[PDB]
Design a protein around this ligand. Structure first.
Ligand SMILES: Cc1cc(/C=C/C#N)cc(C)c1Nc1ccnc(Nc2ccc(C#N)cc2)n1
Ligand SMILES: CN1CCN(c2ccc(C(=O)O)cc2)CC1
Ligand SMILES: [Mg+2]
Lengths: 556, 412
């Protein structure tokens, strides 16, 4: 005998206050019982389960399921109740590697560790909670009782404990062999390197020798799996990656469900296919979730879908990461709150792509959205590569400087350069810091009756120009904006406007270039046409001339 | 040497806070630091039966080149029992803020000499992430009092007071105040005298022991406040008077007797904004009466130690920032202004981060706790960057302001 090291046991508890499962065993047919007895006898011989005495009060139900197109049955021990009662574990797989962060490899070998799994013992003190019962033939003897000695398939802790156990064992090998990479997924280990093939094979033999220290064997006849690998929705090749085929179905009509799946596919595709768009398709899913409902595609959605089909007409691949080179991220504006980007190191060789959509809300502007997109790409890049890319952005350096220095919030974008690819992001209007000499001064106001929703909006000016318009189906806030709109409409290219509306100031000081409100959009359109606009706020009801006159005119 | 039993608050489990993404340089720094800490027995690797987590990152303290590990224990701190068994609590010293000079020391390294209750250790779990999640994150927990945990100064207190008594007995007029990993030492000595005393103090810790060498010098006696001031002008335009009436209306919410009647009357009619309006005698008197009112303190302002402190900040442009600290609206406990935002001339977010640290320091010195910040920044921008500029060993709480305040105009 060659001594082997035991695999250290992970201590396991039930949740505080919870006892183990006591669930009734279902009756089974005589055929299923014989099958389960044979299956369990073999598992017992292999050391996976042990017969137990009558004292154990716990139970989990067991079922027998027929392996399709076969005369062989399979067992199912249904641990749902035990799982509810079992503590939470650290789950390592939560964040999966992105292919674009991986490094090129010459050789990747797959080693089967499915047998090693049953050398990981289940905590002795927890075993009692895994008890189950094979019913007896004709119920004329006590059912056969067993418990697990190993991590049960389907039990909450098995994946985490298996993985954590393998990682601990592999750690010294990885540390002392920095010229390879090792990744575990399910029952397989993947071992990569850039070594010449003989040396790579030597490393694999050395890994096998290391694992034997714990009595863990891997299969001599080497795995059938070899590049390319289908993994987590990707195709991995030695020196490039892509997504698995993206196939958009042909349909005469589309349901909510078809469209959710279509958007899901486009979203998945957008990580390597440049320029994918999903706004108009996603607009179709607004508010409704009857999966069977049929939604007519708008012309805009049909155009979006056609543009995507063209993008997807042939294969695109990403390259892997070279840590010796800078990362570059370039962004383009696509319209309707959509933005697209590519991350590369060498020109025309993308590591990945992606997209960003405008956040839901009342008002927005292109500079804010570009900023948001930069922060998303930055965070994504820290996750994947551990560093921020240098940015190439469709905004002039002078535009950015004007924006950030005058904006009421703190804002920052990391190192970047202008790329002159239209459409460029620009500032569409800029309010004056001081009142304009020689420009007419418009004192604006509006009011509405909260019951009838009737209102008035208007202005008076220092030249004696005046206007009041009666309005229906309106509110105090709408009339305050209406009044500013009237002043913009009726003034020359330079204008001073005096308002008491904290609401309107709050909107305009946010500097939107687009809004969900048709009125705000009309105001923005007017502002764009002016040469100079100074907007002054005063408090309401304080005897301030101009303001007081117009307030009286609009309140009735 | 014997552990103090510690528990979480009733019916709460441990922290389960996501680790945020770290740059390569910070990961490499943390792997090196934690390898050493493990070797020294301060931390131990943990298994999957510990599901807890607290985020970790790395900083450089002000004027230093060595990376420092910083654990963000905000969640654990909220969840940890309060500590009044041995002491009801340390009445905060009101004299500290009156000292001519206050120096801040990082004494956090002292805490590692005291073991942490075995049953509590699991709740200090943290993870060093790998780039692209390619390898399992390295999982550890503390075996000793951790830096940044609110329990540490509390458990170590008897040891610190015993370490410091001879320095205090020999220098009865020095004020020494501990907050988290920081020691605040205030005196009225000439700075040279003062630094030698500070270095004297380091030696006691050093002697007991067998980033401590650093020293952040403050001068709270020179700290600046911001009363409300009105313009003094010879020529007032309609716009100037509108701005004045606006500011006074705002101030009337803070100060009772403010009047704008006579000033508002000046603008009767509908005049061009740039037209010059002579002040009448009635308006000048009202202005004068307002100015006099504004020279007096705000009524009904008091600190309640049971209530949170709130800090608001405004960007004023050209590197300038205004701030107010209060518990109740319109009842400011402190106001201030900065322009000296260091090494951040083209970076707003770095300036704001520095402002937040400065204000928090002021709050610790004055009341012995940190304020809740209302930050003029989008969440996503703040969360992407603040950690790049952080140099303090504590971390306050914050929320985001998405709508531009009009009041910015009134603190300019
Ligand atoms: C995450 C990961 C998944 C699989 C495999 C999952 C599966 N099935 C295999 C490996 C070896 C890894 N780990 C790493 C780590 C760093 N670079 C790489 N590069 C890399 C991996 C595979 C191929 C190929 N062909 C090329 C390069 N892989
Ligand atoms: C060789 N293996 C590894 C894990 N697998 C299990 C684990 C546990 C059980 C069981 O509880 O019987 C079966 C398969 C699937 C393939
Ligand atoms: Mg009004």
């Amino acid at each position: 005998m060659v001594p082997i090291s035991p695999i250290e046991t992970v201590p396991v508890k039930l949740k505080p206050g919870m006892d183990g499962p006591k669930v009734k065993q279902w009756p089974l047919t005589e055929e299923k019982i014989k099958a389960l007895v044979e299956i369990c006898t073999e598992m017992e011989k292999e050391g996976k389960i042990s017969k137990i005495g009558p004292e154990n009060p716990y139970n989990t139900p067991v079922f027998a399921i027929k392996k399709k197109d076969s005369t062989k049955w399979r067992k199912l021990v249904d641990f749902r109740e035990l799982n509810k009662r079992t503590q939470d574990f650290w789950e390592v797989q939560l964040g999966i590697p992105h292919p674009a962060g991986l490094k090129k490899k010459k050789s990747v070998t797959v080693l089967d560790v499915g047998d090693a799994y049953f050398s990981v013992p289940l905590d002795e003190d927890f075993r009692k909670y895994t008890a189950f019962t094979i019913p007896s033939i004709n119920n004329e003897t006590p059912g056969i009782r067993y418990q697990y000695n190993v991590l049960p398939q389907g039990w909450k802790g098995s994946p985490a404990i298996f993985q954590s156990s393998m990682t601990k064992i592999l750690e010294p090998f990885a540390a002392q062999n920095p010229d390879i990479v090792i990744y575990q997924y399910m029952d397989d280990l993947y071992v990569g390197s850039d070594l010449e093939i003989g040396q790579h094979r030597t490393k694999i033999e050395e890994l096998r020798q290391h694992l034997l220290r714990w009595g863990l064997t891997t299969p001599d006849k080497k795995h059938q799996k070899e590049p390319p690998f289908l993994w987590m929705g990707y195709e991995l090749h030695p020196d490039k990656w892509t997504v698995q085929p993206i196939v958009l179905p042909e349909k005469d009509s589309w349901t909510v469900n078809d469209i959710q799946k279509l958007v899901g596919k486009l979203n998945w595709a957008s990580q390597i296919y440049p320029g994918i768009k999903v706004r108009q398709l996603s607009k179709l899913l607004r508010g409704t979730k009857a999966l069977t409902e049929v939604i007519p595609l708008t012309e805009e959605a049909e155009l979006e879908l056609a543009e995507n089909r063209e993008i997807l007409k042939e294969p695109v691949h990403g390259v892997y990461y070279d840590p010796s080179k800078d990362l570059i991220a370039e962004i383009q504006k696509q319209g309707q709150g959509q933005w697209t980007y590519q991350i590369y190191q060498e020109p025309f060789k993308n590591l990945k792509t992606g997209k960003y959509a405008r956040m839901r809300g009342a008002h927005t502007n292109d500079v804010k959205q570009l900023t948001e997109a930069v922060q998303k790409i930055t965070t994504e890049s820290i996750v994947i590569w551990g560093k921020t890319p240098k940015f190439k952005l469709p905004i002039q350096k002078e535009t950015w400087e004007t924006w950030w220095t005058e904006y009421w919030q703190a804002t920052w974008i990391p190192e970047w350069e202008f790329v002159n690819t239209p459409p460029l992001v620009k500032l569409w209007y800029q309010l004056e810091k001081e009142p304009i000499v020689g420009a007419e001064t418009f004192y604006v106001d509006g009011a509405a009756n909260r019951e009838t929703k009737l209102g008035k909006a208007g202005y008076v000016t220092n030249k004696g120009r005046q206007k009041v318009v009666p309005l229906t189906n309106t509110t105090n806030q709408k009339t305050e904006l209406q009044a500013i709109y009237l002043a913009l409409q009726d003034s020359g290219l330079e204008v001073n406007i005096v308002t008491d509306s904290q609401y309107a100031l709050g909107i305009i000081q946010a500097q939107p270039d687009k809004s969900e409100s048709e009125l705000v959009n009309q105001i923005i359109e007017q502002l764009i046409k002016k040469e100079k606009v100074y907007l002054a706020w005063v408090p309401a009801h304080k005897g301030i001339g101009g303001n007081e006159q117009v307030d009286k005119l609009v309140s009735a | 040497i014997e552990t103090v039993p510690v528990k979480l608050k009733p019916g709460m489990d441990g922290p389960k806070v996501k680790q945020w993404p770290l740059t390569e340089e910070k990961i490499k720094a943390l792997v090196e630091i934690c390898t050493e800490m493990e070797k020294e027995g301060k931390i131990s690797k943990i298994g999957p039966e510990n599901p807890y987590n607290t985020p970790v990152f790395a900083i450089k303290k002000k004027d230093s080149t060595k990376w420092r590990k910083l654990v963000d224990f905000r969640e654990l701190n909220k969840r940890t029992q309060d500590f009044w068994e041995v002491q009801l609590g340390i009445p905060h010293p009101a004299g500290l803020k009156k000292k001519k000079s206050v120096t801040v020391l990082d004494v956090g390294d002292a805490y590692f000499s005291v073991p942490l209750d075995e049953d509590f250790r699991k709740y200090t779990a943290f993870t060093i992430p790998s780039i692209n999640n390619e390898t399992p994150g390295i999982r550890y927990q503390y075996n000793v009092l951790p830096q940044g945990w609110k329990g540490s100064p509390a458990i170590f207190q008897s040891s610190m007071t015993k370490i410091l008594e001879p320095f205090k007995k020999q220098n009865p007029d020095i004020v020494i105040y501990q907050y988290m990993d920081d020691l605040y030492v205030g005196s009225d000595l000439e700075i040279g005298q003062h630094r030698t005393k500070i270095e004297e103090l380091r030696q006691h810790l050093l002697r007991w022991g067998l980033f401590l060498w650093m020293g952040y010098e403050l001068h709270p006696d020179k700290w600046t406040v911001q009363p409300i001031v009105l313009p003094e002008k010879d020529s007032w335009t309609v716009n100037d008077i509108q701005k004045l009436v606006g500011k006074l209306n705002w101030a009337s919410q803070i100060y009772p007797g403010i009047k704008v009647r006579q000033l508002s009357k000046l603008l009767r009619g509908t005049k061009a904004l740039t037209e010059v309006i002579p002040l009448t005698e009635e308006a000048e008197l009202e202005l004068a009466e307002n100015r006099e009112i504004l020279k007096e303190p705000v009524h009904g302002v008091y600190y309640d130690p049971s209530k949170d402190l709130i800090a608001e900040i405004q960007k004023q442009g050209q590197g300038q920032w205004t701030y107010q600290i209060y518990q109740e609206p319109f009842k400011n406990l402190k106001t201030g202004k900065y322009a000296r935002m260091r090494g951040a001339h083209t970076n707003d977010v770095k300036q704001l981060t520095e402002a937040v640290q400065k204000i928090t320091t002021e709050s610790i010195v004055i009341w012995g706790k940190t304020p809740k910040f209302k930050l003029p920044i989008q969440k996503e921008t703040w969360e992407t960057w603040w950690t790049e500029y952080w140099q303090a060993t504590w971390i306050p709480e914050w929320e985001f302001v998405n709508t531009p305040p009009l009041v910015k105009l009134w603190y300019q």
